[PDB]
Scaffold this active site. Structure first.
Site, mmCIF file in Angstrom:
data_model
loop_
_atom_site.group_PDB
_atom_site.id
_atom_site.type_symbol
_atom_site.label_atom_id
_atom_site.label_comp_id
_atom_site.label_asym_id
_atom_site.label_seq_id
_atom_site.Cartn_x
_atom_site.Cartn_y
_atom_site.Cartn_z
ATOM 1 N N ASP A 42 -4.608 -3.532 -6.224
ATOM 2 C CA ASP A 42 -5.312 -3.693 -5.200
ATOM 3 C C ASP A 42 -7.013 -3.847 -5.300
ATOM 4 O O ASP A 42 -7.495 -4.247 -4.967
ATOM 5 C CB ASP A 42 -5.032 -2.501 -4.048
ATOM 6 C CG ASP A 42 -4.688 -1.180 -4.770
ATOM 7 O OD1 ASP A 42 -4.827 -0.945 -5.864
ATOM 8 O OD2 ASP A 42 -4.353 -0.511 -3.782
ATOM 9 N N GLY B 289 0.785 -1.107 -0.188
ATOM 10 C CA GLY B 289 -0.116 0.135 0.056
ATOM 11 C C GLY B 289 0.959 1.155 -0.026
ATOM 12 O O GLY B 289 2.222 1.145 -0.101
#
EC number: 2.7.1.33
Lengths: 256, 255, 250, 250, 255, 250
Positions: C108, C8
């Site tokens: 993601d 992330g």
């Protein structure tokens, strides 16, 4: 019938008033965060203090690579001059065939160079070199096709990135060096970035010469701030220091 | 067994020797900061690569970032019980430096010359390092460091164009094939590859005519971005561990 | 055992599957790290959690930050002798991307879309991630990622207020009697209604009013379970779908 | 002739009144400046817009950035020979500040509330300020300032996303098919429903279902002139209230 | 075995007490770490320094950096299976805080006060922490924390002169013998040593004559820059571990 | 008429002398600026304060920031046509600089020394410049610049505390019962004691018992008039000494 041209670059906001063909005055501002009043007060004062009444400006043309100063300069013009400025944007008339995948990716300042370079030197294959904030190289065909090019950092950005990202290493003013073997660290950065861009130009010239133009003869054009440090040498045919502001006017006339 | 540690401006670069050959090499950030922090890493980097920390009986440190020095030296005595060799000004290098101030020459530029003039003893050497900076160093045949040049590296050039130039993104460094870029991404790649290529070509031939004026030379390349200029005939030899070698030789000269 | 890693912007999230279920989970900050730094964390974080690193036979990586991608790959080959599965450009996702540029979609967003459609097969789905950003994704019943929206996250919004002029709690008031209270009443009720405005405007633009399922995931996802905004809270949705993308590419 | 100045976090916003009506407005950046720079700018911004500097007889200042205040106050005694009215804690405002510590409420929020309750007197009011931050202030018909909520601005939200990840501010499309498209589908429809939630929660927590009135000020207010979010668009609400606050204290 | 953690703006500082005496101390760079990064370091720094992680029974956290707090608390319950004692608002301190806002006092100044008035139980105390910031605290003999003052630390006072100036270097902090420096390096050193020496002297006896009116007092001093002023008769005691003593004391008070 | 320009680390401090007396002083922030930005400012600041730029025929510049140097030089030769005097290495000063390298004494310290020896001719002088740096200078009665001390100033000291973990006031008590009062009471009485120590140490070292004259200058000098710290407060001391060095030369 006095036109005004502006190049909103990363180092400076650069202006020049053309009385037809010849520039009577040029000026500079920092490209910062500014309002339409701050920019409006500036543009009027910078004209007036240099023997040039603001009420004589009949047209404004704008070129930019910084979108954050765009709204505020357009708004400064419509208030303080009563001119909706010419914006050098995609896609106005340029006379050029952009060979990029995305033609919008080519900055308006490189387009303005290519417009002026193919006007001042109409029927030749051109390499244009801008020794400005970056050290950009651009190939243009004799048929007015912008093929593409290469982008290096400038002589300021070479000498400042060394001092920025390295401990015990200082910043230096760019001058011409005589010897390539420095006996000081200060003279190593001087020899390094001078004779480094001096060989970078020579290499990019010959790689493009044979690859973009298959060996055909070329005209090499230089422009920008660090341009006059290489007149001794190699390297280019014509130093045209106003090649950006010339082509802003030349794009404004294509769209009048 | 000797542990040699180079502290550069982007990477701490270490490596262990079994006499002459290198068993293991490792990298770190020139960032993480306490003696406890570095000492945990050094012990876990040796252990996970099948090399007990207790086997290390010699440590030698070359550094150019002084803000790492104190705690790295302090990481050695606490976790290994070794006061490391410091490649400093005053220690026995077998060479005369022709700088106006021989303290101004960094420890990595000395260590590269030490190892180069050891491996090729009676030749004039131009060592190019391709790291944080691209450095050119001229050394004569009689072990004399004459100085040289410094350029911004490949990574420092690209990142200068992404920070100081708005609407220009950060790029990957590859061996570029088209000199004429059809995208902003392709123009910067062609610039940072053929720009340095001719910067190498110019600096090598200019040094050859000034410090040596037409004599026989041997070109040696080192550094992370050195692998990209193999095809050219830009350098004679490629020595990837030249900095780590010269820390071992300077420790040997001073042990 | 398979180790799944999600890169992330703030945190490198990781989990290890014992077949179907996650046995242990861990978090690392997204920053500048070499292959040796990453591998030392990776081998140690398993070992300290009663899991020998040598039990790990598979590694699969989903990434949104490219500046971690080389050293994280190179950490696995040096410290585990495993060449990891990279959910990247070209691999078998099993779905229909309706973007202009299909590679502009984050890894993601693909991993979330894969997993949600697996557990809930013949249904139209809005997946909300309450992470670094607050992302809304329309996926049809026919395994088609139609697209969606990206808002700033709860952390980013509360931090940008303090930067240029706080703890994210469930606010009961909208009339804050302090400047601390007014920012907290802001990000809570102003995203609770941002969701209502996104959930329902997509509901007609992407499904023309059909029967849908609303899945929520992330760290800030819990704080909206009272209001009756989403149906399911599945916190491990991203990790499920890295495992699933590795399974289709086995 | 009165020169009214609002000093905000991104801009110095000024205006010159001929009594009640405005004949000139201007903008400067809120940076570190000196009294001489600010006094040159001020004398210049007036004259070049045909308002001669010597005609200004009163100056009134409201500020929320304390580091611009000293040099701007000093610019008025040096260049205008006027010690300006300062909208500071303690002056006559005419309103019951129901905050815990009433000094916390910014001079900008007070200036808007004074102007809102002068123009629309005996009414409950939600004033929304689409500025640096999007602010929601509750004021009762009894002229009591009750408090409210602070969301980050639309500019801060479009910049927070791009700043913390490895766009220009009406969006008709809810389903995005680009990253630059999902970001403005997120931003536009996110703050659209943020306001919708905040309005009706304030309308029921502060005003329990009573007839309210909604005012909107700020540079990003006009992007919601279609959706039926507010009743009135008063762009110079902050400058009317400085003028009103001077009037009470002179 | 008790483990005491301090969270300063510069460092996370830890020290394991064998009851009353400190067996080992360590340091971590205060950065936004995760619940798992912190948990690895803590169990590694103990293990490599001859102290098994299981032998630790209790943990006590002092804090001034709230962003490090959530995950350091989580590092204890997950990896050590211990819920740490936190020194903050609510717990037993045995002090009467005379601040207008008693919450606005840092936990480490509270920690320091608890240890000072335990070691020296019936005296008026001025404690000076020569750390990142040079702080001063008036504490009465009745254990009233009356407040005090805060100066830039000797490193801050040096780094401010160089980072906020063009053409001025960052300097070493040495005990100089002259106030008439004849170089730039010497001038800052003479100012940064004798400016603080007189600043301390003024802050000592302004507080002596206003908070204690002119009665018997005792001047303690803690921190890494404390020992530079040891000769000058500035303080009565140099207590190096005043924070960790006070964290352990507050742990004891609340267990 | 002559213009003296003091370039600092925070402010560009100018002043116009008509013979012996200052008619006007002004201030610009030391920024990245061009000849055009500065030349406009200079011609504009003079005119707005009843002083035509055409009447100025001499300009002198002392500078401690060499990045301001080139563009300020250009603004003089273009907008004023006056090639300015530069107080640089090599010019006549009429003093013995006892520095190991006299060049590394800032051009601003030379200007303070020149003016002190002119006004008070046969006296040992300490000059405290309360500026960006709080500086101390030992000048003997035979005009020997003996050297001195450099502390961080009141602004940088306070601002260092908040950049690593206030507005500068004359505090009445050392006991701070707030964080704000603690930074105020440390910085005030800290510099007060710093002065007291650096005055009494220089007096015993550089002159060694004998009569001294303590002079104060700079913006933060004003606060210490009560404590019997200095003898004279000369706020224009730098500008006078820029004028005097131009009078000694050219």
């Amino acid at each position: 019938s006095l036109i005004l041209c502006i190049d909103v670059g990363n180092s400076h906001i650069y202006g020049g008033v053309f009385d037809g063909d010849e520039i009577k005055l040029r000026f500079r501002h920092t490209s910062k965060v500014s309002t339409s009043d701050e920019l409006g007060i500036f543009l009027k004062s910078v004209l007036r203090e240099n023997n040039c009444s603001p009420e004589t400006i009949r047209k404004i043309a704008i070129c930019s690579v910084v979108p954050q100063v765009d709204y505020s300069l357009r708004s400064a013009c419509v208030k303080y001059f009563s001119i909706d400025p010419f914006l050098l944007q995609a896609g106005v008339k340029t006379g050029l065939n952009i060979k990029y995948r995305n033609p919008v990716e080519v900055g308006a300042d490189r387009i303005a160079n290519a417009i002026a370079a193919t006007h001042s030197f109409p029927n030749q294959n051109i390499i244009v070199i801008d020794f400005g904030t970056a050290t950009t190289f651009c190939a243009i065909s004799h048929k007015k096709a912008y093929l593409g090019g290469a982008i290096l950092p400038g002589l300021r950005l070479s000498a400042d990135a060394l001092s920025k990202n390295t401990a015990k290493l200082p910043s230096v003013e760019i001058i011409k060096t005589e010897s390539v073997v420095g006996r000081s660290t200060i003279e190593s950065i001087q020899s390094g970035v001078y004779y480094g861009v001096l060989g970078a130009c020579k290499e990019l010239i010959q790689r493009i010469h044979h690859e973009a133009f298959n060996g055909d003869q070329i005209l090499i054009l230089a422009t920008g701030g660090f341009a006059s440090l290489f007149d001794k040498q190699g390297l280019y045919d014509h130093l045209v220091p106003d090649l950006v502001l010339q082509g802003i006017r030349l794009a404004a006339m294509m769209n009048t």
